[PDB]
Amino acid sequence: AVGACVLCNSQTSLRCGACIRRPFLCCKCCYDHVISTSHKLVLSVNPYVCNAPGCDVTDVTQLYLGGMSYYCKSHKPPISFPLCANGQVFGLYKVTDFNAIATCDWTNAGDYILANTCTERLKLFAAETLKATEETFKLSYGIATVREVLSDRELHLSWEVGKPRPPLNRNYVFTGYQIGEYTFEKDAVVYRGTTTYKLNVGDYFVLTSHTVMPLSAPTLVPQEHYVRITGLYPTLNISDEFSSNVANYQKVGMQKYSTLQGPPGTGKSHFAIGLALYYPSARIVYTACSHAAVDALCEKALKYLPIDKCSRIIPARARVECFDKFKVNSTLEQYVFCTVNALPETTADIVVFDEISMATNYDLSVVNARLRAKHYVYIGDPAQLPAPRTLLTKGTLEPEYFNSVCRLMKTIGPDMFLGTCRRCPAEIVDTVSALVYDNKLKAHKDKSAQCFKMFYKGVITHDVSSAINRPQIGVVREFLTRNPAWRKAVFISPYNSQNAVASKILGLPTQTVDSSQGSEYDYVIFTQTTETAHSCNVNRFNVAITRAKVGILCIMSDRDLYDKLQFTSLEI
């Protein structure tokens, strides 16, 4: 019942009973909170409530201290002081931003803007409060029950009435009843179970709302600049392959934390693995939010680092199939590859946190709490996709508000910038360089002359709110008959329902823009599907077109983005 104030760190016996995270508030801050919000319950050793029998006064502003006890205006003794007086709430040991975080419902972009522009302690309060709200929102969804099992990949579901149905894609992960985690995609629904289990009738699925633990560490440790490389020992025999990053690797050792902005195909994994070769005796923990990003770092390490000095940390509750070529769960290996949520409590010479646009401040804080490091390297790209904000429905979240690292990269600039895209045909590099990189991204490849664009709005239908554009898929099918080399293409769209329709009509492998991030293919076929804020988002557009190594076909709905594509236009 005694701790440090979230706002001014002052010692207090007071916590807000109305905040969902019950934060410590000092006398001055507790007062400014209760006096400006609907939050009137204050908790000390005991709640500040009227102690008189049967009384219901709990509002701190209507309460008084009568001896060692609390009473309202109606039950107070003649000798009593108000609990709220002279800008303070009475307590042992004797804000506009805090109030907005404490009372917002997290449905507006302004809520996330504030959560990233506030003090460091309020960033943790906002992250914990937000994450708690997001988990309690998972309880709002209805239970799915097996009505009938059709096959090994298809079944029929009966939903709970009165409660809304969660969107059906790979982002929404259910728990069966615990018969393993399950995902669903569109009466016959397609199911995918983590554990191969014979689906029984009457079995039910719920999105597993986990308990949000409190945060302790900052999103970023205080910056420290050094005169020399600190705690790290450079090689004098650095391979030519990594020579381009030697100045950047030295910058890494000369400051507590460093940020690396790496546009698509500019060498992010190459940089991360090269850091190990440049400081060969340094113990590095490689982390990312997703198993996929951690696996991509494992792939690069498998090529350049000694396999016996690596370990892939996999939590006992395996939620996906991941990297198999390293010794599993050997926390003490020189190179540890592990998702943020599975990080052990350990130390490191360098912590490399990859795909930083996908991290939340909650993730930034967890990394700082589990890992004590000499150096922290944040690698990613604020021009790429952020983590989905399931509660956010009003407004667009700009890259400078994705998290603390993205905020720094967009305001003061990244510490390091990989400026040459080695993946994409020049038409793609030139389009995205002008679009999101202020013309600082350069092409290594020539123009492929295999980048096409077609302006075709088609017809937009909807599987609930997920969009489908059958005429856009029809245009693709027509193009494929005339361009058989594109048979090997990956179909990409901003919607899973569009991808499900394209998978049946085209037979191409399918991928959403959000699930394509970090991946690359020779040929990409993209159908914009709609003109929505979602399908027109420049970071999503950036990711979509930068998946291509050789060619891309963009079937566009939006005039602006279509005109910005430096591609050959097709007719029909």
Q: Minimum Å distance from CB 8 to Zn ion?
A: 3
How far does the chain reach from its first CA to its final CA, in angstroms?
Answer: 71
As a whole number of angstroms, the distance between CA 533 and CA 171 comes to 19
Cβ neighbours of residue 155 under 8 Å, at least 6 residues apart? Answer: 146, 148, 149, 188, 189, 191, 199
225 among annotated binding-site residues: no
265 among annotated binding-site residues: yes
Nearer to Zn ion, 50 or 157 (CB): 50
Q: Minimum Å distance from CB 210 to Zn ion?
A: 23
Q: Minimum Å distance from CB 48 to Zn ion?
A: 12
Q: Minimum Å distance from CB 57 to Zn ion?
A: 5
In this structure, are residues 513 and 540 in contact, taking their beta carbons and an 8 Å threshold?
yes
Name the DSSP letter for residue 269: H
CA 145 remoteness from chain centre:
30
Amino acid 73 reads K
5 among annotated binding-site residues: yes
Cβ neighbours of residue 462 under 8 Å, at least 6 residues apart? Answer: 468, 497
Nearer to Zn ion, 7 or 467 (CB): 7
Q: Minimum Å distance from CB 5 to Zn ion?
A: 3
As a whole number of angstroms, the distance between CA 92 and CA 522 comes to 66
266 among annotated binding-site residues: yes
Residue 450 three-state SS: coil
72 among annotated binding-site residues: yes
As a whole number of angstroms, the distance between CA 553 and CA 212 comes to 43
118 among annotated binding-site residues: no
16 among annotated binding-site residues: yes
Nearer to Zn ion, 100 or 358 (CB): 100
Q: Minimum Å distance from CB 360 to Zn ion?
A: 22
Nearer to Zn ion, 66 or 167 (CB): 66
310 among annotated binding-site residues: no
Q: Residue numbers of the site for Zn ion (CB under 5 A)? A: 5, 7-8, 10, 16, 18-19, 26, 29, 39, 50, 52, 55, 57, 72, 75, 102
Q: Minimum Å distance from CB 28 to Zn ion?
A: 6
The secondary structure of 101-143, three-state, reads HHHCCCCEHHHHHHHHHCCHHHHHHHHHHHHHHHHHHHCCCCC
As a whole number of angstroms, the distance between CA 298 and CA 447 comes to 31
Comparing CA positions, the residue from 472, 418, 423 lying closest to residue 443 is 423
Beta bridge partners of 145: 158, 204
Nearer to Zn ion, 23 or 262 (CB): 23
8 among annotated binding-site residues: yes
Both tokens assigned to 427: 């038409």
Distances (CA, A) of 232 to 31, 244, 463: 48, 19, 54
Q: Minimum Å distance from CB 365 to Zn ion?
A: 20
Nearer to Zn ion, 18 or 343 (CB): 18
Q: Minimum Å distance from CB 41 to Zn ion?
A: 8
Q: Minimum Å distance from CB 552 to Zn ion?
A: 50
The secondary structure of 373-440, three-state, reads EEEEEEEECCCCCCCCCCCCCECCCCHHHCCHHHHHHHHCCCCEECCEECCCCHHHHHHHHHHHCCCC
Q: Minimum Å distance from CB 11 to Zn ion?
A: 9
554 among annotated binding-site residues: no
Nearer to Zn ion, 48 or 335 (CB): 48
Nearer to Zn ion, 38 or 237 (CB): 38
Nearer to Zn ion, 40 or 453 (CB): 40
Nearer to Zn ion, 69 or 532 (CB): 69
Positive or negative, the CA dihedral 351, 354, 360, 361 is: positive
Q: What angle do CA 321, 325, 328 make, to 5 degrees?
A: 75
Comparing CA positions, the residue from 420, 424, 421 lying closest to residue 550 is 424
As a whole number of angstroms, the distance between CA 358 and CA 341 comes to 13
Nearer to Zn ion, 16 or 343 (CB): 16
Please report, to the nearest 10 degrees, the dihedral formed by the alpha carbons of residues 113, 119, 125, 127 taken in order.
40
Binding residues for Zn(2+): 5, 8, 16, 19, 26, 29, 33, 39, 50, 55, 72, 75
List, as residue ranges, the binding site for a ribonucleoside 5'-triphosphate: 262-269
